[PDB]
């Protein structure tokens, strides 16, 4: 359901992920988009090059700042429809959840359950 996948077929996405992993080998590519039904602002950009040793919390902080929420606006992130463990790094999430186009897909929402 991500817009990046509605916009580009698999082979295009794979060739982009492959090319990015070869050009920036110490980064992992991550597509960040709103979850279905989410009532949250859009990000300016959806394609991120993430340092593999970022912790999940550090990633949350960086993405949250780009959404420009008020502090009182809650924010949740999902990988494969589940909130990731906080104790992970983004390289771990990528190792365990990247798709066959070489991208990790992260959804975000105001709600704590994906697709609510």
């Amino acid at each position: 359901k991500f817009q990046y996948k509605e916009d580009h077929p698999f082979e295009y996405r794979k060739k982009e992920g492959e090319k990015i992993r070869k050009k920036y080998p110490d980064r992992v590519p991550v597509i960040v988009e709103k979850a279905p039904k989410a009532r949250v602002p859009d990000l300016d950009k959806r394609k991120y090059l993430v340092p593999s040793d970022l912790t999940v919390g550090q990633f949350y902080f960086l993405i949250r700042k780009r959404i420009h929420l008020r502090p009182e606006d809650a924010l949740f992130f999902f990988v494969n429809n589940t909130i990731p463990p906080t104790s992970a790094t983004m390289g771990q999430l990528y190792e365990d959840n990247h798709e066959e186009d070489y991208f990790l897909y992260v959804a975000y929402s105001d709600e704590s359950v994906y697709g609510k």
């Binding site: 990015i20 920036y24 980064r27 950009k45 394609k47 991120y48 090059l49 993430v50 340092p51 040793d53 970022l54 550090q58 990633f59 960086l62 780009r66």
Partner: peptide, 10 residues
């Protein structure tokens, strides 16, 4: 297009 995220520092 892409956004390169920073790393934290000691």
């Amino acid at each position: 297009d892409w956004e390169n995220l920073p790393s934290p520092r000691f």
